[PDB]
Design a protein around this ligand. Structure first.
Ligand SMILES: OC[C@@H]1O[C@@H](OC[C@@H]2O[C@@H](OC[C@@H]3O[C@@H](O)[C@H](O)[C@H]3O)[C@H](O)[C@H]2O)[C@H](O)[C@H]1O
Ligand SMILES: [Cl-]
Length: 443
């Protein structure tokens, strides 16, 4: 039976290096795994005895002083062409975008990382990094980086949280710093203190798009955190959602803070809070899944979503989760309903599809409501009945083409492992053109 070993790394940023996977998150926390199922905790908090950066309060003194904090926010580590590992570290006071971002470099992934210096600040009283007065309604909070190479080998860094939005900078592949003269870089979306943070870019060679992953809402249990995605032919945009809305249009209304209403229409929503648990049956369930990264395995063509999540009834406790991603016929990813356990897409037979399913509809909102199941039946005659009606068909090996309440969804059928009930399950995971995700789990 599949074996899991859990770790707690908030805001996990995945990096594969020579056969081992690492996540680096906030609070200088980290963990590693060879199989994406059994993780080993390496570090958990900022202290002078954290081995990633010995004597961290001295090493990054300037950052802690600027940000007026004793911790660090969501890191990224990326290996550059020199073979070294570059940690983009950052800190924020937490009540305002009083923040600094810098880079430290290590010869080895587990450290020690040596400070090269701060290269961005936000929350100053005067002139900002772009030469104009700092204004949090339009300028970023300089936190939550993802430094990545595009398909052509050019180095970029996307970043941002709330404040003025999400930005992208061209980076120097020799030094790891931004190329000079860019200010905060190019704006991709956001503004007016929208609850959008934690950008992450993954190229998919098969669909020929860059996917920008984002977290909407707040991270806490009542915050409505959810994982969203948009895409572009270019790493620096313009990004669009499944309806063709430009992500650049996304922002809170002028003069407001945390205007969730205005932003919820934008982006494909892959996953929010849900539970498969009902009165007479245990099930998996997450609260506020988010701040993700993602990985594409060149060797197999498979993709994975890595994130932290809270859980129904566990308050603010969080753990790392990994779900496999599959691209649908329209070039959008759908997440496996259950965490990764070594499953792969296989031929699925119609005989194994028919039956009763628990259904989760993630919708398009930012909501603290934990989405619950309804029951539907996929019938032999290709109709769907029960608490919802529609139709289903299978294309090719495992492609799911499902209509529910007059909306057409596309995705996959996949037999998985349910780690709570400890049994195999037939699932589907599908997406419509409005970016609404539906998961089915067979009874
Ligand atoms: O997920 C981490 C999130 O960061 C926290 O927000 C931090 C920043 O606060 C908002 O700005 C507040 C304003 O700054 C000051 O000028 C003045 O006091 C406030 O008007 C920004 O939108 C954020 O970047 C969140 O608490 C947390 O969820
Ligand atoms: Cl789980």
């Amino acid at each position: 039976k599949p074996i899991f070993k859990e770790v707690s790394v908030h805001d996990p940023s995945i990096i594969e290096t020579n056969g081992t996977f690492y996540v680096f998150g906030s609070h200088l926390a980290s963990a590693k795994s060879n199989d994406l199922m059994q993780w080993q905790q390496l570090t958990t908090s900022v202290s002078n005895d954290n081995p990633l950066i010995p004597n961290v309060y001295e090493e990054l003194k300037e950052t802690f002083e600027w940000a007026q904090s004793d911790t660090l926010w969501a890191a990224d580590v990326t290996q550059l062409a020199d073979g070294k590992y570059y940690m983009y570290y950052n800190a924020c006071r937490g009540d305002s975008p009083r923040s600094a971002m810098g880079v430290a470099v290590a010869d080895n992934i587990e450290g020690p990382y040596k400070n090269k210096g701060i290269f961005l600040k936000s929350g100053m009283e005067g002139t900002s990094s772009d030469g104009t007065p700092y204004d949090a309604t339009k300028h970023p909070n300089v936190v939550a980086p993802h430094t990545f190479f595009d398909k052509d080998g050019k180095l970029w860094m996307v970043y941002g949280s709330y404040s003025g939005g999400i930005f992208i900078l061209e980076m120097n592949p020799k030094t790891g710093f931004p190329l000079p003269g860019q200010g905060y870089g190019k704006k991709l979306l956001g503004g007016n203190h929208s609850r959008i943070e934690g950008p992450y870019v993954l190229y998919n060679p098969d669909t020929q798009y860059y996917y920008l992953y984002l977290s909407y809402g707040g991270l806490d249990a009542t915050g409505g955190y959810n994982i969203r995605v948009a895409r572009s032919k270019k790493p620096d945009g313009p990004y669009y959602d499944a309806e063709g809305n430009p992500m650049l249009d996304v922002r809170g209304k002028g003069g407001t803070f945390f205007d969730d209403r205005s932003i919820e229409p934008y982006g494909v929503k892959l996953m929010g809070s849900y539970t498969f648990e009902t009165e007479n049956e245990k099930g998996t369930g997450y609260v506020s899944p988010g701040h993700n990264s993602a990985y594409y395995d060149e060797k197999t063509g498979r993709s994975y979503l890595i994130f932290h999540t809270r859980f129904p009834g566990r308050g603010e406790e969080h753990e790392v989760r990994v779900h496999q991603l599959f691209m649908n016929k329209d070039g959008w990813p759908v997440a496996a309903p259950y965490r990764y356990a070594g499953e792969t897409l296989k031929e699925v037979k119609q005989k194994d599809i028919t039956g009763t399913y628990k259904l989760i509809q993630h919708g398009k909102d930012i909501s603290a409501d934990i989405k619950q199941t309804i029951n539907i039946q996929l019938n032999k005659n290709h109709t769907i009945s029960g608490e919802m009606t529609g139709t289903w068909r299978k294309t090719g090996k495992n492609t799911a083409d499902i209509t529910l309440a007059g909306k057409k969804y596309n995705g996959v059928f996949l037999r998985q492992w349910d780690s709570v009930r400890e049994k195999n399950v037939m699932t589907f995971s599908v997406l419509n053109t409005s970016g609404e995700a539906v998961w089915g789990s067979k009874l």
